[PDB]
Amino acid sequence: KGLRRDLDASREAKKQLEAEQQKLEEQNKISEASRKGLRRDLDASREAKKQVEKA
Secondary structure (H helix, E strand, O other), X not given: OOOOOOOOOXXXXXXXXXXXXXXXXXXXXXXXXXXXXXXXXXXXXXXXXXXXXXO
């Protein structure tokens, strides 16, 4: 159900709701859990085996 994506046009309305949820995620997590700094969890691989281009 819900096939109306032309007459209503919710684009500017969607960019306001999504901006509040995404900002509250970065503030609660503390930049991917940064307790110590350069230890085991922060300096593990390349983003949990993700950005492994050069390594």
